[PDB]
Structure 1
Amino acid sequence: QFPKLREWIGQRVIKDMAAQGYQITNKLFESTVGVKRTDIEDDNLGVYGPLMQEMGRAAGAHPDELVFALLKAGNANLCYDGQNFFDTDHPVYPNVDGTGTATTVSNLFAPAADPGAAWYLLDTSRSLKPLIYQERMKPSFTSMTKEDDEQVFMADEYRYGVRSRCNVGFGFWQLAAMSTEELNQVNFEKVYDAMRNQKADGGRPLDIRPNLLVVPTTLRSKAKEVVGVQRLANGADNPNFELVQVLDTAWLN
């Protein structure tokens, strides 16, 4: 960002910019299953050859596993700045900022708040190669003649999970998400306001607009009372009703 405006006194202080870079390399993946000729050719029941479609759906489901495992491990993997994606010591010019809250008493499951409105989303994924498959169902195969048979069915995929700004995301607050009060409202509005109160390199607000709340299946009820209930226990409004849309996923924890 361009340096902030300054009051003209004496000469000028010629400043410098700050270019940033992120590097990430593709990885190779494969799942392979081997069977025998006698097994399949003696399978008169026909409940042994859905291998093709099972393998196809495994390949289709791989990206979900990759992305959500990365989301789980965000507290361990590093973002561009140099710290963990979810860390308490994200650096600003002289300042230190934290995007992960704990309790050291009750930390079981972590909800996640993701402002996906921006052009670049969170925990992005890169697709270098689509899926490709192969079989061993002809006599001339080396595997077909290596033993009785090795009728392998495998997958080939080049992928790796990616991430983005580790300040636009706040995805670790394992304190609590639901109670009569102070867990239903405090720890959620806390994340919302902390994300809306971020400061950029230079001294300008980030303009964060949290819109997605991601929780495991176990915290969905807490998330739904936090957002999705119009009235309140005492008959009043829920000030956070319809504040952010919640999504329930079973690929985390």
Structure 2
Amino acid sequence: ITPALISALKTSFQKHFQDALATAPSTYLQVATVIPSTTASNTYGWLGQFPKLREWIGQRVIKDMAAQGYQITNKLFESTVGVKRTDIEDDNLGVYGPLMQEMGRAAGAHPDELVFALLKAGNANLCYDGQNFFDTDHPVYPNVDGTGTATTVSNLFAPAADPGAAWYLLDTSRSLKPLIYQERMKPSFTSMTKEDDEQVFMADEYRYGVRSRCNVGFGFWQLAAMSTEELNQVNFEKVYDAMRNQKADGGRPLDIRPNLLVVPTTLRSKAKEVVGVQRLANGADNPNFELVQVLDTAWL
């Protein structure tokens, strides 16, 4: 029991923690974006401005200019683990040490359930426009002049109160991912191991909790889609055609190719006849075994 032993133990724990948190199978990175923040809240400007280029010259020819803002209000999360009542000074530390690398792996994927919490409750979150995220009055600009006129359509699909499960169609080719991920501080490791410490005289359960600050938000509304009707080949083709047909101001094509698909496990049967068979479904009949292969997450 010497300070050198404490230093070596802290170094070993730091190495073990740093080994994890890096190779975790992150899925939020596909739909989220890493942004370095510095304050407790970040405001937004434009919300539906597709960045594109025009023939005319100068570097000042056309642009949308920003609108009212949208804040993130970064939140906070934490984990904690430790049992060292008998591990220390007993040669039993060989265990309780490699098992927490899984804790690091799981904690590193937390943004996944955070983005899925936003995804599931997208209809109950206020949008900068004023109405629900999946409303039927999404503004569309006929011309670039102030606030000329905002026409709209029934953007998404929903039947007349027919039972079903909500499956979402997402895209990730554009780095303007539909969701946002703002982080103030990266996860940190704290060691309270202090010989004969006032509050750690209690056996030797040396607390090794961590601290982190981050949150997620909404980006583009058009990049994401939803469908609660019965999952069918005709309905799938309808959804794909509706999403691909989307056009921005001026009627200029977008080339938006959907890449990600999210389906609940209950609909997994249909999500498997749609993907994985080249004989009768997504095959002989309306072959569609190319894009938006189902990922079948379960954090919802």
State TM-score, norm by structure 2.
0.43
Q: Distance in 2 between matches of 1:199 and 1:160?
A: 52
Note if contact 1:36-1:151 (Cα within 8 Å) is conserved in structure 2: no
Secondary structure of the corresponding residue to residue 222 of structure 1: helix
Secondary structure of the corresponding residue to residue 64 of structure 1: helix
After TM superposition, give the deviation of residue 161 of structure 1 in Å.
Answer: 22
**Stretch deviating more after TM superposition (141-150 or 95-104):** 95-104
C-alpha spacing 1:220/1:19, structure 2 compared with 1 (3 Å): same
After TM superposition, give the deviation of residue 145 of structure 1 in Å.
Answer: 11
Aligned residues: 252
C-alpha spacing 1:169/1:60, structure 2 compared with 1 (3 Å): closer
**Stretch deviating more after TM superposition (173-182 or 215-224):** 173-182
C-alpha spacing 1:106/1:228, structure 2 compared with 1 (3 Å): farther
Q: Which residue of structure 2 lines up, in the alignment, with residue 224 of structure 1?
A: 272
**Stretch deviating more after TM superposition (6-15 or 223-232):** 6-15
Note if contact 2:278-2:289 (Cα within 8 Å) is conserved in structure 1: yes
C-alpha spacing 1:12/1:48, structure 2 compared with 1 (3 Å): closer
**Stretch deviating more after TM superposition (179-188 or 229-238):** 179-188
Note if contact 1:177-1:183 (Cα within 8 Å) is conserved in structure 2: no
After TM superposition, give the deviation of residue 56 of structure 1 in Å.
Answer: 1.9
Note if contact 2:75-2:214 (Cα within 8 Å) is conserved in structure 1: no
Q: What's the CA shift string for 1:73-129, capped at 9, x where partnerless? A: 223334555544433332224899999999999999999999999999969999999
Q: Which residue of structure 1 lines up, in the alignment, with residue 213 of structure 2?
A: 165
Note if contact 2:263-2:295 (Cα within 8 Å) is conserved in structure 1: yes
C-alpha spacing 1:138/1:42, structure 2 compared with 1 (3 Å): farther
Secondary structure of the corresponding residue to residue 121 of structure 2: helix
C-alpha spacing 1:144/1:210, structure 2 compared with 1 (3 Å): closer
Note if contact 2:265-2:297 (Cα within 8 Å) is conserved in structure 1: yes
After TM superposition, give the deviation of residue 195 of structure 1 in Å.
Answer: 0.8
Note if contact 1:200-1:206 (Cα within 8 Å) is conserved in structure 2: yes
Q: What's the CA shift string for 1:209-238, capped at 9, x where partnerless? A: 223222122222212322432222799433
Secondary structure of the corresponding residue to residue 218 of structure 1: coil
**Stretch deviating more after TM superposition (212-221 or 158-167):** 158-167
Q: What's the CA shift string for 1:9-58, capped at 9, x where partnerless? A: 99999998666755434322112357684798899798766663353233
Q: Distance in 1 between matches of 2:234 and 2:125?
A: 28
C-alpha spacing 1:236/1:153, structure 2 compared with 1 (3 Å): farther
C-alpha spacing 1:202/1:157, structure 2 compared with 1 (3 Å): farther
**Stretch deviating more after TM superposition (14-23 or 53-62):** 14-23
Give yes or no for the alignment of 1:241 onto 2:279. Answer: no
Secondary structure of the corresponding residue to residue 55 of structure 1: helix
Note if contact 1:126-1:161 (Cα within 8 Å) is conserved in structure 2: no
Note if contact 1:178-1:225 (Cα within 8 Å) is conserved in structure 2: no
CA RMSD of aligned residues (A): 12.0
**Stretch deviating more after TM superposition (114-123 or 190-199):** 114-123
Q: Distance in 2 between matches of 1:99 and 1:220?
A: 44
Secondary structure of the corresponding residue to residue 268 of structure 2: helix
After TM superposition, give the deviation of residue 152 of structure 1 in Å.
Answer: 9.2
C-alpha spacing 1:140/1:245, structure 2 compared with 1 (3 Å): closer
Note if contact 2:177-2:219 (Cα within 8 Å) is conserved in structure 1: no
**Stretch deviating more after TM superposition (132-141 or 1-10):** 132-141
Note if contact 1:213-1:247 (Cα within 8 Å) is conserved in structure 2: yes
C-alpha spacing 1:212/1:142, structure 2 compared with 1 (3 Å): closer
Deviation above 6 Å: which 4+ runs of structure 1?
Answer: 1-16, 38-51, 94-182
C-alpha spacing 1:51/1:21, structure 2 compared with 1 (3 Å): same
After TM superposition, give the deviation of residue 188 of structure 1 in Å.
Answer: 0.9
Unaligned runs of 5+ in 1: none
Note if contact 1:125-1:162 (Cα within 8 Å) is conserved in structure 2: no
Note if contact 1:113-1:211 (Cα within 8 Å) is conserved in structure 2: no
C-alpha spacing 1:149/1:87, structure 2 compared with 1 (3 Å): farther
C-alpha spacing 1:22/1:53, structure 2 compared with 1 (3 Å): same
